[PDB]
Amino acid sequence: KTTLTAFGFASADLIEIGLEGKGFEPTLEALFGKQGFFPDSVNKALYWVNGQVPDGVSKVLVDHFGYTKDDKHEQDMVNGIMLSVEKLIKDLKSKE
């Protein structure tokens, strides 16, 4: 929002766009929470996909998505991504 006072002492809101919403936190956590889609999905993709991102990007990825070096699951790329998808689907209707 912005209020303009350029007509002497007469004021007038030049423009205002009002955003109102609730229930964002559950989706925020289902995307980036402990069981969120992004952390597990990125971890599985990094484990099953050859090659590592530059070290600078690697630090951020480890910090945010909790990439794990070693996994004992002979489950494949498809199941690795699909576990994250499954938990996200449960996240969707398990909350607001």
| Angstrom distances, CA of residue 17 to CA of 2, 12, 20, 35 | 10, 15, 10, 34
- 27 phi and psi, to 5 degrees? -70, -40
Burial class (CB in 10 A: 0-12, 13-18, 19+), 27: middle
2 neighbors 27 (Cβ within 8 angstroms): no
| Angstrom distances, CA of residue 47 to CA of 2, 36, 53, 61, 95 | 49, 17, 12, 13, 30
Tokens of 96: 């607001």
The sign of the CA dihedral 6, 7, 11, 12 is negative
> Distance between CA atoms of 15 and 29, rounded to whole angstroms?
33
**How was this entry determined?**
cryo-EM
> Distance between CA atoms of 83 and 46, rounded to whole angstroms?
14
Going by the DSSP 8-state scheme, the letter that residue 35 receives in this structure is T
